[PDB]
């Protein structure tokens with residue numbers, strides 16, 4: 001399923017993003033002078049299951065979770081440098097049941113253990129001066145599709 | 151290369167769309183009550199190498215070519231019905247040197263012999279009440295990529 | 301990297317199967333009346349890092365590990381029924397660092413925590429009356445490749 | 451549909467190779483010192499619809515056709531040099547109705563107008579000292595599949 005997720009907006013998923021699901025986010029551009037860019041996977045009740053806060057200025061990517069009216073929990077962070085590949089940077093998220101796998105253009109995958117046991121009903125995209133395009137292309141799969149030889 | 155082509159706008163290709171090139175156009179939606187939707191492959195001098203006029207009302211898809219300040223030539227047309235597959239309809243265009251191959255979601259390919267011997271420098275998208283989303287996702291290849299087993 | 305793995309034989313990998321690596325095994329046939337079929341991921345020292353024993357007669361698929369001249373460890377099982385799709389069944393294995401993910405044609409993935417900390421140097425295929433063809437096609441990737449829309 | 455085509459043998463297709471069909475042939479090896487290697491697309495009546503003679507020693511690849519007990523027609527040639535990419539060279543053939551498109555690893559496609567109007571029922575592979583592995587992996591599609599971003 002293809003979705004066009006606009007900045008400071010979100011997309012309501014046709015089906016719940018759950019175990020086996022794969023979300024491939026791709027941007028048509030890379031704005032070098034962009035600021036903090038955020039992607040959230042939200043449950044039907046608007047809980048933030050997965051929070052991805054890309055911070056060029058602070059040189060880190062922060063992962064966290066939070067209930068709608070709750071506080072953020074401990075942060076899991078990695079360095080921002082050498083993760084995205086211009087001019088079409090991407091972000092791939094896979095639900096492995098007990099944890100999410102997050103892959104950028106470079107480096108090894110990032111694994112984030114699930115904190116809120118609910119499936120995602122929507123994906124949000126927030127930024128004042130986005131690092132990526134608006135919208136970003138989002139292809140969501142119910143399971144990993146057949147792979148090309150290369 | 152990924153591009154986001156907005157309605158009544160166009161995208162300047164990073165490289166010329168020429169023999170072997172493949173353009174995969176995908177829409178995040180299908181507007182059943184949409185009107186005539188148009189896609190043009192333009193040369194650097196703005197000649198319309200390939201004109202694709204999808205007409206739901208007239209129930210036909212018309213293919214043609216025209217120089218910037220010239221007149222349209224003879225039309226090559228096929229029935230509109232049962233070509234697109236909602237909710238993510240697509241259009242694939244391949245440059246085979248002496249002709250273009252155009253493929254929709256259903257039916258056999260359409261072959262259109264080249265009339266203006268120039269390479270395409272941009273792709274335009276025009277519609278008053280588009281049948282597709284805005285923008286549409288466009289992945290352009292310099293050659294056919296490796297194919298998945300399915 | 302493409303390999304042709306023959307029954308009761310193995311293939312030596314050009315590169316070590318390590319974190320991020322993906323192996324897509326595909327069969328050109330499905331012999332419904334075949335017997336127990338095994339696939340092993342071996343280390344350079346010939347330790348069996350991942351043993352996949354497909355037993356149609358016992359209606360089960362067994363996962364385990366063992367040192368070259370050591371004993372099998374505790375078994376991890378899953379039903380055999382409705383996992384493979386004829387006439388071209390497949391098995392996909394992905395190294396996630398701390399565990400392997402194994403996916404068949406249907407159902408959820410199976411996750412197997414690593415027990416021997418070494419990378420795989422070869423993949424073996426054993427059977428007297430295999431459920432699959434000989435050889436089976438094996439495409440091995442250093443990392444997940446770009447994914448098609450479907 | 452996946453097939454394993456062994457040298458000096460052939461595979462009978464489950465479906466007729468016809469317009470829109472695509473056959474991706476891939477080798478698990480490249481024997482630079484091999485000799486002339488041939489691939490034929492045959493009709494049910496065993497007419498050779500498309501003959502591809504790869505001759506490294508003559509530095510040429512020859513295309514032709516001929517009836518089961520008939521004579522070769524006029525040859526269509528292209529240089530052999532820099533067409534294949536080791537260690538996993540490939541050959542892709544697409545049926546465009548009025549002609550076949552043949553693509554190797556490098557260079558532009560070769561187009562061959564159909565001379566015998568029948569669909570292919572089998573694909574043959576012949577060689578005394580093949581440039582490729584035995585068997586070669588062959589994935590046959592009824593139509594072009596969705597394409598990955600790259």
Ligand SMILES: CC(=O)N[C@@H]1[C@@H](O)[C@H](O[C@@H]2O[C@H](CO)[C@H](O)[C@H](O[C@H]3O[C@H](CO)[C@H](O)[C@H](O)[C@H]3O)[C@H]2O)[C@@H](CO)O[C@H]1O
Nearest residue numbers: 036037038051052053062063064065072073074075076126
């Ligand atoms: C080094 C360190 O610990 N710094 C902390 C900051 O990371 C932290 O900033 C917040 O971090 C959370 C995730 O841990 C979010 O990224 C949060 O931003 C998001 O929530 C905001 C409301 O809380 C607001 O809605 C933003 O638009 C949205 O992006 C971010 O503020 C701060 C605050 O907790 O503490 C620092 O110590």
Ligand SMILES: CC(=O)N[C@@H]1[C@@H](O)[C@H](O[C@@H]2O[C@H](CO)[C@H](O)[C@H](O[C@H]3O[C@H](CO)[C@H](O)[C@H](O)[C@H]3O)[C@H]2O)[C@@H](CO)O[C@H]1O
Nearest residue numbers: 186187188201202203212213214215222223224225226276
């Ligand atoms: C049955 C028949 O022959 N009908 C003819 C119409 O198809 C034709 O309409 C024009 O067709 C051309 C392609 O053949 C274009 O689609 C054209 O529209 C486009 O160009 C316009 C300017 O000429 C304008 O810019 C539109 O926005 C753009 O989409 C379309 O008008 C008419 C006119 O030639 O004749 C009919 O006989």
Ligand SMILES: CC(=O)N[C@@H]1[C@@H](O)[C@H](O[C@@H]2O[C@H](CO)[C@H](O)[C@H](O[C@H]3O[C@H](CO)[C@H](O)[C@H](O)[C@H]3O)[C@H]2O)[C@@H](CO)O[C@H]1O
Nearest residue numbers: 336337338351352353362363364365372373374375376426
């Ligand atoms: C219910 C139960 O516990 N059954 C046990 C069997 O599963 C088990 O069978 C062996 O299981 C291991 C995996 O745990 C292997 O699959 C093993 O087969 C392989 O090793 C054999 C030598 O041990 C032999 O080489 C086979 O060819 C090879 O495939 C399989 O026999 C048995 C024995 O451990 O115990 C049962 O209790």
Ligand SMILES: CC(=O)N[C@@H]1[C@@H](O)[C@H](O[C@@H]2O[C@H](CO)[C@H](O)[C@H](O[C@H]3O[C@H](CO)[C@H](O)[C@H](O)[C@H]3O)[C@H]2O)[C@@H](CO)O[C@H]1O
Nearest residue numbers: 486487488501502503512513514515522523524525526576
């Ligand atoms: C420059 C030139 O014209 N050379 C001609 C050769 O190419 C030609 O060789 C034959 O070419 C055809 C294709 O046109 C085949 O490739 C043929 O090989 C195949 O058929 C053989 C029987 O005719 C035999 O069965 C081979 O095993 C099989 O691969 C190849 O010999 C020759 C002969 O036609 O004439 C040259 O003038």
